[PDB]
A paper describes a structure:
The formation of a moving junction (MJ) between the membranes of the parasite and its host cell is essential for invasion. Two important components of the MJ are Apical Membrane Antigen 1 (AMA1) on the parasite surface and the Plasmodium rhoptry neck (RON) protein complex that is translocated to the erythrocyte membrane during invasion. The extra-cellular region of RON2, a component of this complex, interacts with AMA1, providing a bridge between the parasite and its host cell that is crucial for successful invasion. Here, we report the crystal structure of the complex formed between PfAMA1 and peptide segments of PfRON2, which, together with our previous structural results on the TgAMA1-TgRON2 co-structure, highlights a conserved, crucial interaction in apicomplexan host cell invasion.
From the 67-residue construct, PfRON2-5, that we previously showed to have affinity for PfAMA1, and guided by the TgAMA1-TgRON2sp structure, we synthesized two analogous PfRON2 peptides: PfRON2sp1 (residues 2021–2059; numbering from the initiation methionine in PF14_0495), and PfRON2sp2 (residues 2027–2055). PfRON2sp1 and PfRON2sp2 were co-crystallized with the first two ectoplasmic domains (DI, DII) of recombinant PfAMA1 3D7 or CAMP strains, respectively. PfRON2sp1, traced from Thr2023 to Leu2058, includes a disulfide bridge between Cys2037 and Cys2049 and makes several direct contacts with PfAMA1, resulting in a total buried surface area of 3154 Å2 (1441 Å2 for PfAMA1 and 1713 Å2 for PfRON2sp1). Overall, the binding paradigm established by TgAMA1-TgRON2sp is maintained, with an N-terminal helix seated at one end of the AMA1 receptor-binding groove and extended through an ordered coil to a disulfide-closed β-hairpin loop, generating a U-shaped conformation. Similarly, exposing a functional receptor-binding groove on AMA1 requires displacement of the extended non-polymorphic DII loop, which adopts a disordered state (not modeled between Lys351 to Ala387); this region is stabilized by DI in apo PfAMA1. Intriguingly, the backbone of the N-terminal helix and additional coil of PfRON2sp1 (2024-QQAKDIGAG-2032) overlays remarkably well with a section of the apo PfAMA1 DII loop (360-YEKIKEGFK-368) (rmsd<0.4 Å), which also includes a helical region. The majority of intermolecular contacts are formed by the segment Lys2027-Met2042 of PfRON2sp1. An influential residue on PfRON2 appears to be Arg2041, a residue specific to the P. falciparum species, located at the tip of the β-hairpin with its guanidyl group fitting snugly into a preformed pocket of PfAMA1. An additional feature of the PfRON2sp cystine loop region is the presence of a cis peptide bond between Ser2043 and Pro2044; the Ser-Pro-Pro segment contributes negligible buried surface area but is important for maintaining the β-hairpin conformation for efficient complex formation. Since PfRON2sp1 is more biologically relevant than its truncated counterpart, it is used for the following analyses unless otherwise noted.
Author numbering:
A (entry chain B): 2023 to 2058
B (entry chain A): 108 to 350, 388 to 441
């Protein structure tokens, strides 16, 4: 996991908010594969 | 030096400021972990990612739900409302009301669109996904996976029967990637002025010394059948942030003088500061598109 971070492995995310107003919520239809 | 501003776009350390082959130039905190993020300020023309021993193209969405890992690529999975892929038109519509973004060129718009998504754990809004713009279909593809290279039995597995194991992959330029442009969150909106794009016909990169443009005094010669293959080689040897000890800050073998007659890609790793008029040469960089040439005119 240290070396994963070091190669650019990212955080898991389920939904997102937008940076640009108006703030909007956006969700993945399903969970990203566990092995990431 | 009358060359100073013309040559400003070629000072890749300054105008790009990050890895090119692998760009992981910044860190973004999310719940106390510093994730590595692409951060280069220039578009990387023609770069894509190759998944080794695989038919999976990297713009395929990441595996979600019941899919195998090795069946998905790198791109955002489907969302509601659907954020990726998004065509140029869709983006112009979606961002029509935004003063800063609405009228951006397609590449910067694609970068700002990818950088619009805050992951739900990212209380501080640090994390911005990179993107790939495909200018044939005119579609922006947000990349869920920011990683660009992973090799060695340690961290990936090439076995096509183990479909939930991590795939190996590497960045590349390839004729099939000609229409792809790889975009960090930091792509500047004036990249057209301050970043390389076109290969310079009838020109050889040089160094300005005491009133004269001198040849690059030491280069690393690779044979190459054409300009495309030279650009590919320069890309392979260019600034890389792949394992702030691991950051290149844009330092590397980023420039090439391609001699079309001897078919030599003359590759070097210091910023050039002038041009020499030589009908045998085309001046390329790892950032430049591997096809487009600017007329000697």
């Amino acid at each position: 996991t240290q070396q994963a971070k070091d190669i650019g492995a990212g955080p898991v995310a389920s939904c997102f908010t937008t940076r640009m107003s108006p703030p909007q919520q956006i969700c993945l239809n399903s969970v990203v594969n566990t092995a990431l | 030096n009358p060359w100073t501003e013309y040559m400003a776009k070629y000072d890749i350390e300054e105008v790009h400021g990050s890895g090119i082959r692998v760009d992981l130039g910044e860190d973004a905190e999310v719940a106390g972990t510093q994730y590595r993020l692409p951060s280069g300020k220039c578009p990387v023309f023609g770069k894509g990612i190759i998944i080794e021993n695989s038919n999976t193209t990297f713009l395929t969405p990441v595996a979600t739900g019941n899919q195998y890992l090795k069946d998905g690529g790198f791109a955002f999975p489907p969302t509601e409302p659907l954020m990726s892929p998004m065509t140029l038109d869709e983006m112009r519509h979606f961002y029509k009301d935004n003063k800063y973004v609405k009228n951006l060129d397609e590449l910067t718009l694609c970068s700002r669109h990818a950088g619009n998504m805050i992951p739900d754990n990212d209380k501080n809004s640090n994390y911005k996904y990179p993107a790939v713009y495909d200018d044939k279909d005119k579609k922006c593809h947000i990349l869920y996976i920011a990683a660009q290279e992973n090799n060695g039995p340690r961290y990936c597995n090439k076995d096509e029967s183990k479909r939930n194991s991590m795939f190996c992959f590497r960045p590349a330029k390839d004729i099939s990637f000609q229409n792809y442009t790889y975009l960090s969150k930091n792509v500047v909106d004036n990249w057209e002025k301050v970043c390389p794009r076109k290969n310079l016909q009838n020109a050889k990169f040089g160094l300005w010394v005491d009133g004269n443009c001198e040849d690059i005094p030491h280069v690393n010669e690779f044979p190459a059948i054409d300009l495309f293959e030279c650009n590919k080689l320069v890309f392979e040897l260019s600034a890389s942030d792949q394992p702030d000890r691991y950051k290149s800050h844009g330092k590397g073998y980023n420039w090439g003088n391609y001699n079309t007659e001897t078919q030599k890609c003359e590759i070097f790793n210091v910023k050039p500061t002038c041009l020499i008029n030589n009908s045998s040469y085309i001046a390329t960089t790892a950032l430049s598109h591997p096809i487009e040439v600017e007329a000697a005119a």
